[PDB]
Design a protein around this motif. Structure first.
Motif, PDB file in Angstrom:
ATOM      1  N   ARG A   1       0.852  -1.174   0.000  1.00  0.00           N
ATOM      2  CA  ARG A   1       0.000   0.000   0.000  1.00  0.00           C
ATOM      3  C   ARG A   1       0.891   1.228   0.000  1.00  0.00           C
ATOM      4  NH1 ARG A   1      -2.016  -0.204   6.363  1.00  0.00           N
ATOM      5  NH2 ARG A   1       0.114  -0.345   7.212  1.00  0.00           N
ATOM      6  N   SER A   2       0.367   2.342  -0.493  1.00  0.00           N
ATOM      7  CA  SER A   2       1.198   3.512  -0.727  1.00  0.00           C
ATOM      8  C   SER A   2       1.676   4.145   0.583  1.00  0.00           C
ATOM      9  CB  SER A   2       0.455   4.536  -1.587  1.00  0.00           C
ATOM     10  OG  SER A   2      -0.188   5.506  -0.783  1.00  0.00           O
ATOM     11  N   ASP A   3       0.999   3.824   1.679  1.00  0.00           N
ATOM     12  CA  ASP A   3       1.173   4.568   2.925  1.00  0.00           C
ATOM     13  C   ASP A   3       2.501   4.281   3.642  1.00  0.00           C
ATOM     14  OD1 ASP A   3      -1.222   5.944   2.569  1.00  0.00           O
ATOM     15  OD2 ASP A   3      -1.929   5.535   4.612  1.00  0.00           O
ATOM     16  N   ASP A   4       2.959   3.031   3.600  1.00  0.00           N
ATOM     17  CA  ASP A   4       4.262   2.694   4.172  1.00  0.00           C
ATOM     18  C   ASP A   4       5.227   2.024   3.186  1.00  0.00           C
ATOM     19  OD1 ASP A   4       2.680   0.444   4.254  1.00  0.00           O
ATOM     20  OD2 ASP A   4       3.269  -0.182   6.276  1.00  0.00           O
ATOM     21  N   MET A   5       5.030   2.300   1.901  1.00  0.00           N
ATOM     22  CA  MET A   5       6.029   1.984   0.893  1.00  0.00           C
ATOM     23  C   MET A   5       7.259   2.879   1.024  1.00  0.00           C
ATOM     24  SD  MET A   5       5.988   2.118  -3.232  1.00  0.00           S
ATOM     25  CE  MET A   5       6.808   3.713  -3.206  1.00  0.00           C
ATOM     26  N   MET A   6       8.434   2.259   0.993  1.00  0.00           N
ATOM     27  CA  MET A   6       9.709   2.978   1.096  1.00  0.00           C
ATOM     28  C   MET A   6      10.360   3.070  -0.275  1.00  0.00           C
ATOM     29  SD  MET A   6      11.037   0.789   4.345  1.00  0.00           S
ATOM     30  CE  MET A   6      10.608  -0.749   3.528  1.00  0.00           C
ATOM     31  N   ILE A   7      10.960   4.219  -0.565  1.00  0.00           N
ATOM     32  CA  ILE A   7      11.884   4.348  -1.685  1.00  0.00           C
ATOM     33  C   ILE A   7      13.319   4.438  -1.165  1.00  0.00           C
ATOM     34  CG2 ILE A   7      12.572   5.753  -3.667  1.00  0.00           C
ATOM     35  CD1 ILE A   7       9.736   6.793  -3.841  1.00  0.00           C
ATOM     36  N   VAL A   8      14.119   3.421  -1.479  1.00  0.00           N
ATOM     37  CA  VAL A   8      15.432   3.247  -0.869  1.00  0.00           C
ATOM     38  C   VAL A   8      16.485   3.099  -1.964  1.00  0.00           C
ATOM     39  CG1 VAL A   8      16.902   1.712   0.499  1.00  0.00           C
ATOM     40  CG2 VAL A   8      14.552   2.205   1.249  1.00  0.00           C
ATOM     41  N   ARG A   9      17.279   4.145  -2.163  1.00  0.00           N
ATOM     42  CA  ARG A   9      18.251   4.176  -3.260  1.00  0.00           C
ATOM     43  C   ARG A   9      17.576   3.904  -4.611  1.00  0.00           C
ATOM     44  NH1 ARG A   9      23.832   1.695  -0.478  1.00  0.00           N
ATOM     45  NH2 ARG A   9      23.101   1.952   1.685  1.00  0.00           N
ATOM     46  N   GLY A  10      16.409   4.509  -4.818  1.00  0.00           N
ATOM     47  CA  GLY A  10      15.693   4.374  -6.081  1.00  0.00           C
ATOM     48  C   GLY A  10      14.772   3.163  -6.148  1.00  0.00           C
ATOM     49  N   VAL A  11      14.885   2.273  -5.164  1.00  0.00           N
ATOM     50  CA  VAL A  11      14.129   1.020  -5.171  1.00  0.00           C
ATOM     51  C   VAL A  11      12.875   1.147  -4.296  1.00  0.00           C
ATOM     52  CG1 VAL A  11      14.214  -1.473  -4.785  1.00  0.00           C
ATOM     53  CG2 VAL A  11      16.287  -0.240  -5.476  1.00  0.00           C
ATOM     54  N   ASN A  12      11.726   0.815  -4.873  1.00  0.00           N
ATOM     55  CA  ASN A  12      10.477   0.770  -4.114  1.00  0.00           C
ATOM     56  C   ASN A  12      10.369  -0.525  -3.317  1.00  0.00           C
ATOM     57  OD1 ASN A  12       9.592   3.278  -5.193  1.00  0.00           O
ATOM     58  ND2 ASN A  12       8.767   2.252  -7.008  1.00  0.00           N
ATOM     59  N   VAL A  13      10.289  -0.424  -1.999  1.00  0.00           N
ATOM     60  CA  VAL A  13      10.103  -1.621  -1.193  1.00  0.00           C
ATOM     61  C   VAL A  13       9.041  -1.517  -0.106  1.00  0.00           C
ATOM     62  CG1 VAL A  13      12.579  -1.242  -0.709  1.00  0.00           C
ATOM     63  CG2 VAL A  13      11.299  -2.941   0.638  1.00  0.00           C
ATOM     64  N   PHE A  14       8.206  -2.547  -0.047  1.00  0.00           N
ATOM     65  CA  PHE A  14       7.202  -2.649   0.998  1.00  0.00           C
ATOM     66  C   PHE A  14       7.775  -3.403   2.190  1.00  0.00           C
ATOM     67  CE2 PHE A  14       4.841  -2.655  -3.089  1.00  0.00           C
ATOM     68  CZ  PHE A  14       4.178  -1.460  -2.946  1.00  0.00           C
ATOM     69  N   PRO A  15       7.385  -2.996   3.403  1.00  0.00           N
ATOM     70  CA  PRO A  15       7.782  -3.655   4.635  1.00  0.00           C
ATOM     71  C   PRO A  15       7.585  -5.167   4.615  1.00  0.00           C
ATOM     72  CG  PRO A  15       6.690  -1.634   5.164  1.00  0.00           C
ATOM     73  CD  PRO A  15       6.635  -1.755   3.665  1.00  0.00           C
ATOM     74  N   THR A  16       6.474  -5.636   4.044  1.00  0.00           N
ATOM     75  CA  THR A  16       6.217  -7.072   3.959  1.00  0.00           C
ATOM     76  C   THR A  16       7.264  -7.823   3.145  1.00  0.00           C
ATOM     77  OG1 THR A  16       4.611  -6.672   2.164  1.00  0.00           O
ATOM     78  CG2 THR A  16       3.734  -7.053   4.384  1.00  0.00           C
ATOM     79  N   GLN A  17       7.879  -7.139   2.186  1.00  0.00           N
ATOM     80  CA  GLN A  17       8.972  -7.733   1.430  1.00  0.00           C
ATOM     81  C   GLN A  17      10.130  -8.078   2.367  1.00  0.00           C
ATOM     82  OE1 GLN A  17       8.666  -4.522  -1.844  1.00  0.00           O
ATOM     83  NE2 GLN A  17       9.807  -6.195  -2.806  1.00  0.00           N
ATOM     84  N   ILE A  18      10.414  -7.175   3.295  1.00  0.00           N
ATOM     85  CA  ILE A  18      11.402  -7.424   4.338  1.00  0.00           C
ATOM     86  C   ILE A  18      10.949  -8.521   5.297  1.00  0.00           C
ATOM     87  CG2 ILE A  18      12.688  -6.415   6.253  1.00  0.00           C
ATOM     88  CD1 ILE A  18      13.611  -5.357   3.652  1.00  0.00           C
TER      89      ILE A  18
END
Ligand SMILES: Nc1ncnc2c1ncn2[C@@H]1O[C@H](COP(=O)(O)OC(=O)Cc2ccccc2)[C@@H](O)[C@H]1O
Ligand SMILES: Nc1ncnc2c1ncn2[C@@H]1O[C@H](COP(=O)(O)OC(=O)Cc2ccccc2)[C@@H](O)[C@H]1O
Ligand SMILES: O=C(O)Cc1ccccc1
Ligand SMILES: [Mg+2]
Ligand SMILES: [Mg+2]
Ligand SMILES: [Mg+2]
Ligand SMILES: [Mg+2]
Lengths: 423, 426
Positions: B321-338
């Motif tokens: 979801r857009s609300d806690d999606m991170m952009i990290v060094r150009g990479v879009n990552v969701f917390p659930t991916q972690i």
């Protein structure tokens, strides 16, 4: 707005109703609750021994220990699959239960209590009583909903946010403990607002003892009618009895559902109406957990009906539980509260602290200045002396008055903890 | 078992017809009675009459959280204040305020009851409700649904974890309704005091309010010896019970689209996607009185999938979801991916928190984790774990993460929704 037929019935209509229902209730308990089958047999009475209402004195009392000994579910008079709702008094907790009809009846009675408090078509109800296993929040909730009103189910805590939403939503009625009400009032003022100017028209306060002086103070500070709602979880919850706003003469008991008695708490004898003694309830319509002559441990007297045909209880200021013994003198917190509220220079917040120094008890009364009187040493020293004198002369205990900084005493979020005994 | 409603497995043809009539009503009710939808439809150049088939829904404007924020507190209500039976509101600008008539409340109770049945509830079940009671929709949502389903409701709410475990022991509840993040803390406390979680009375857990992986699901199922199902909702649409997973298939929440009509759009263009394609999930209320909601953009990313255990379609478990999606060094990552990579490490606990900082040009992602109690003193086991985890994150997600192993209980525990991400950058 509209009253139930039963609310204006003749004392004789009510009396016939109570007898039919008490017969049912005693039989239901005897037949379906193993605890009541035993208690009755072991006391040597049968449900059939009730021919009139006076016969109730024949039946054994119930107390908290009955519940505690049958924890968690041992006293229920229906199978577990008809238990719609569990509640629990944190003080193993004491556990109570309700069928869906019991929940319906409880909703109806709290809705009645809210009408009695003067609610109108269109009112919003801000609920601040705790939501959870406590009976207060969910009781007031379902009652306000059943009454057809707009329910805002806030519950306890987050006092700044509660004040935010009282401004923004403009509730007409608040349902909250007296002690938390005072904190809510504080925070309004802190936020630079005139509490009198709030939308609130009505407070329905209960769950803990609060003096009539405390009522008038709150009514003054808030610009509301403040009415007294009573009950206890073992019996049902909030809405066992509630004050009519037109008379404000103590809670009227809904004795079409809860049959009250007053007893000598030492002997167990029933006293005629008017006499001080221990309040006792028998449920008349309860299914899951019928309770028979439950000893509340609350001290009060029965009084003739005014705004209704049903009788009132005199306000409760003394319950046996939280009475203190200090230097061989008996004292209730509310006795201290009444003396405190005479001092306009002090906050209405306090804690009593009990210690031992040598053989002798020490009572310390922790108090605060009003924020506006904090710097006024003259005002505070007058209050401190006067309060000391009033406790000595009217109560007969010597109190150490300890004046803390503003906000020095910990605010209640639900039931205030009046007394810390560390002896 | 508890009985289906007939609608639950009635023909799709029948379902389509009744969605159409309800949608025509909902659009007209919103346009006639909501000041906000009067304005929105007019300014989009559309009328309720313009809906002839379900496909015409794409003609109508979107609603967003902004629309509710701008009409705080009551500006969006579509009935007179005296018909509002219930107000709910967010705790985290100003709070967004939602409202319900008695009929809305009834339908909500029926939908959560339906969800609880779909979870495998039985006659005689007790439901332990740990979702928060108050202005949040979760607790009172679950409460009313479990009551309506005829079950034994234990209304605990959140917090007091030690007491909650005491009463799961004492009361022997069959179903627990709680966030997945808090469930984990509850299970920890069972172990702590010191019981075998798998030996609990608990049979079913109904978990929602926050994203959680299927990896997390299997973790909780194995730990607790339960079935764990996914219950979905958002307060703007209703509350919990917009969609809920069938226990027999565990294949994503089934959407109750007899009451909430879902779409999936390209979040950039707003174009409606065909079923099966990933995008942003959008709801339109079909029977709501007080706060009709029209094409509400949830900000949740997912896809629509054909109904299996029901006629109604499913959502895929929410990918992001857009609300806690991170952009990290150009990479879009969701917390659930972690979360998915963390859950591979048996020497580490299932609790985490992500902290983002800057160092020069670099986004620094620090993943705070804990050992298992058992493995806490096993320094070699923890080191292998840190190492594999950091590698999996780089190789599978393409991000460089610092793994920061805290002491047991060093991460603050969720009693509701976990705060996955603490972004300290600027
Ligand atoms: N109006 C009152 N005045 C004095 N004491 C009260 C009043 N109302 C409750 N109490 C005291 O608290 C007990 C029971 O506490 P318990 O937690 O079981 O039940 C809930 O306090 C139920 C309640 C909730 C909200 C409003 C009113 C009543 C009762 O026996 C009295 O001693
Ligand atoms: N099962 C789920 N999976 C993933 N995300 C979920 C799930 N359920 C809720 N969410 C997220 O949280 C939002 C809304 O939060 P909100 O506070 O509005 O409502 C309540 O979280 C309603 C709820 C309560 C209890 C159980 C389930 C659902 C939604 O848009 C999703 O982003
Ligand atoms: O636990 C109790 O009986 C007392 C209480 C008061 C207010 C809110 C929660 C609990
Ligand atoms: Mg006013
Ligand atoms: Mg004063
Ligand atoms: Mg088990
Ligand atoms: Mg692990």
């Amino acid at each position: 707005l509209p009253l139930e037929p039963i609310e204006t019935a003749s004392r004789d209509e009510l009396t016939a109703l109570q007898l039919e229902r008490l017969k049912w209730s005693l039989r239901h308990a005897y037949d379906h609750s193993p605890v009541y089958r035993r208690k009755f047999d072991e006391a040597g009475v049968h449900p059939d021994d009730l021919k009139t209402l006076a016969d109730l004195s024949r039946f054994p009392f119930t107390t908290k220990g009955d519940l505690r000994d049958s924890y968690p579910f041992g006293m229920f008079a229906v199978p577990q699959d008809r238990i719609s709702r569990i509640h629990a008094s944190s003080g193993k907790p004491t556990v109570v239960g309700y069928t869906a009809a019991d929940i319906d009846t409880w909703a109806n009675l709290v809705a009645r209590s809210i009408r009695a408090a003067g609610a109108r078509r269109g009112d919003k109800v801000h609920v601040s009583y705790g939501y959870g296993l406590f009976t207060g929040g969910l009781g007031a909730h379902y009652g306000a909903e059943r009454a057809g009103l707009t329910v805002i189910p806030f519950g306890g805590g987050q006092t700044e946010k509660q004040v935010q939403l009282i401004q923004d939503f403009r509730p007409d009625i608040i349902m909250v403990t007296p002690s938390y009400m005072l904190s809510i009032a504080d925070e309004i003022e802190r936020q630079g607002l005139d509490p009198v100017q709030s939308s609130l028209r009505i407070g329905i306060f209960g769950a803990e003892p609060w003096t009539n002086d405390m009522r008038v103070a709150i009514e003054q500070r808030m610009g509301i009618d403040a009415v007294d709602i009573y009950g206890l979880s073992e019996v049902m919850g909030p809405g066992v009895a509630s004050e009519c706003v037109e008379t404000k003469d103590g809670p009227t008991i809904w004795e079409d559902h809860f049959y009250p008695e007053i007893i000598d708490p030492e002997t167990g004898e029933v006293l005629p109406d008017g006499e001080l003694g221990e309040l006792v309830f028998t449920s008349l319509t309860k299914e899951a957990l019928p309770i028979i002559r439950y000893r509340t441990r609350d001290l009060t007297r029965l009084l003739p009906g005014t705004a209704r045909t049903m009788r009132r209880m005199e306000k409760i200021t003394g319950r046996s539980d939280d009475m203190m013994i200090v230097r061989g003198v008996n004292v209730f917190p509310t006795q201290i509260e009444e003396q405190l509220l005479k001092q306009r220079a002090l906050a209405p917040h306090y804690q009593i602290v009990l210690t031992k120094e040598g053989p002798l008890d020490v009572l310390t009364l922790n108090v605060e200045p009003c924020p506006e009187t904090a710097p006024d040493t003259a005002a505070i020293q007058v209050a401190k002396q006067a309060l000391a004198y009033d406790i000595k002369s009217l109560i007969g205990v010597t109190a150490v008055i300890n004046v803390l900084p503003v906000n020095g005493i910990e605010r209640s979020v639900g039931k205030a903890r009046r007394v810390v005994d560390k002896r």
